[PDB]
Amino acid sequence: GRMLGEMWKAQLNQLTRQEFMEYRRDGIIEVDRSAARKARREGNVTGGHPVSRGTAKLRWMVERGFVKPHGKVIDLGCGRGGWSYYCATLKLVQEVKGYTKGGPGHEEPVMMQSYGWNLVSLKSGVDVFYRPSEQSDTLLCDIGEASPVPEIEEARTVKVLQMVEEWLSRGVEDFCVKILCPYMPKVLKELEKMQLRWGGGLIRVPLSRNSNHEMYWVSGASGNITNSVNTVSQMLINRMNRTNRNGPKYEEDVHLGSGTR
Ligand SMILES: Nc1ncnc2c1ncn2[C@@H]1O[C@H](C[C@@H](N)CC[C@H](N)C(=O)O)[C@@H](O)[C@H]1O
Secondary structure (H helix, E strand, O other): OOOOOHHHHHHHOOOHHHHHHHHHHHEEEEOOOOHHHHHHHHOOOOOOOOOOOOOHHHHHHHHEEEOOOEEEEEEEOOOOHHHHHHOOHHHEEEEEEEEEEOOOOOOOOOOOOOOHHHHHEEEOOHHHHOOOOOOOOOEEEEEOOOOOHHHHHHHHHHHHHHHHHHHHHOOEEEEEEOOOOOOOOHHHHHHHHHHHHHHEEEEOOOOOOOOOOEEEEEEEOOOHHHHHHHHHHHHHHHHOOOOOOOOOOOEOOOOOOOOOO
């Protein structure tokens, strides 16, 4: 017996390229990044433009109380820094440490002057899978690289969970962890065990593209994991089979301001 998500992935992989591109943003929420893309090219670091689409995804979860960043924030796989710079704007946050691998094929941290930027320290050249754990109040992780092979996505997601387990054991109050492939058996088995110990629940952020099944394990949710994943799989399959496409629903990107804290 297979999860519905396995059927979604199989159907996704059978789409033609043009079908895939018509499907991937159909009916999703998307922030208009035109001004932000221009800002990064012009070296505009004070205009409040997020360095990535990640900022809007985390803002969506924070504003709904799914995670409450505060104290010392650690951002595993910080990339350009979208999540890290966002957290630094938040009143209860006091320090942000971001780590990311960088190098060929991987995003480097971007130095910004969004509000609270002086609270942020981003370090490239760090493979978090071999970094000793550190104490934190808020633990964030947005790692996981897509593959057409569900077993590869499954293994990559399990490795993330096994790393997060070590960091959560230092004593973490709030967390938000990307689950790249929530429908495969090894991920479900691992996640149910970690939810039993650490709590939380899985949520789907509507800014995620239909072309991926990513969900976020967040301390501020509580649902049954199997049911949560199936709900997303049915929604994504329903969208795949409704062939009068409309593209995304457009909204405004986050404004991160400027200035030190
Ligand atoms: N083993 C690793 N160690 C550190 N960083 C990694 C590793 N594997 C992947 N990454 C990085 O993790 C990042 C994941 C991104 N989705 C993070 C985006 C970030 N949340 C933002 O808002 O911009 C990518 O930039 C990867 O290069």
